[PDB]
Ligand binder design. Structure first.
Ligand SMILES: COc1ccc(N[C@H](NS(N)(=O)=O)Oc2ccccc2)cc1OC
Ligand SMILES: [Zn+2]
Length: 257
């Protein structure tokens, strides 16, 4: 029964999921003056041309766009990664106001929202097996700032009315995730975890330097979603982000000098 409120939010999660106070938790603050250029990083390859989106779902915490991951249709390779990682879904975290919403921060700076593209390591055969491994997942994180509209985000925005409440889903085929990327693929990378319960420490984080711009109108439609189920009292789906966690014994590396 976890959530983001006073009584079931991030400060409570450790009781059901003790790993919340683990050695490799996410998100983290990215101190740009402590992260180091790593020349050993190979180029990052985002290969989404044949992506096959299936559906969108309000899971009571965020909304998920899910993809067909039965083959290597949309994959992330290179960068810090060994092998091939298949896209399984994306989702966002966002705020009640534009001054907050992201999970990662950059020199303590909070963005309005954060996009998570979730991929699993094909050497482990399925997602469930992957989340039992220290290198099972790779998540591509993209910051959102408010300014001009993001054209590739509008189709997402325009389906949200049809999935306002928990448990609601809609057909969401022929959506191209390439329309959510910034120009530049400059990133920071570090080893971490899922930022939601069960907070598994299986993730290679790849966080893009360059934010994308979304319109106020677009983010306002995110804030119209509901945490609650149909016919329940309205709890707006806002501030579904986990704050920064201790870096502990970890190095954040930059792919750019
Ligand atoms: C196919 O199964 C999964 C797919 C994806 C994630 N990741 C993800 N959160 S995050 N920030 O760690 O990536 O899950 C949630 C959860 C609630 C709201 C929003 C995103 C977790 C999954 O099973 C645990
Ligand atoms: Zn996430």
């Amino acid at each position: 029964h976890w959530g983001y409120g006073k009584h079931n939010g991030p400060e409570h999660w450790h009781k059901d999921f003790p790993i919340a106070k683990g050695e490799r938790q996410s998100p983290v603050d990215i101190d740009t003056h402590t992260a180091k250029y790593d020349p050993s990083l190979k180029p990052l390859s985002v290969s989404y041309d044949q992506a096959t989106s299936l559906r969108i779902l309000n899971n009571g915490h965020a909304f998920n766009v899910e993809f067909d991951d039965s083959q290597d249709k949309a994959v992330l390779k290179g960068g810090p990664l060994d092998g091939t990682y298949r896209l399984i879904q994306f989702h966002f975290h966002w705020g009640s106001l534009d001054g907050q919403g992201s999970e990662h921060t950059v020199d303590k700076k909070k963005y309005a929202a954060e996009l998570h593209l979730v991929h699993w390591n094909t050497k482990y055969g399925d997602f469930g097996k992957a989340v039992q491994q220290p290198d099972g997942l790779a998540v591509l994180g993209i910051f959102l700032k408010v300014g001009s509209a993001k054209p590739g985000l509008q189709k997402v925005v325009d389906v949200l009315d049809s999935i306002k409440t928990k448990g609601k889903s809609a057909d969401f085929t022929n959506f191209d995730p390439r329309g959510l990327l910034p120009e530049s693929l400059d990133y920071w990378t570090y080893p971490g975890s899922l930022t939601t319960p069960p907070l598994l420490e299986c993730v290679t984080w790849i966080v893009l330097k360059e934010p994308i711009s979304v319109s106020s109108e677009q983010v306002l439609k995110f804030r119209k979603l509901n945490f609650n189920g149909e016919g329940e009292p309205e709890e707006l789906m806002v501030d579904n982000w986990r704050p920064a966690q201790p870096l502990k014994n970890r190095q954040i590396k930059a792919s750019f000098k």
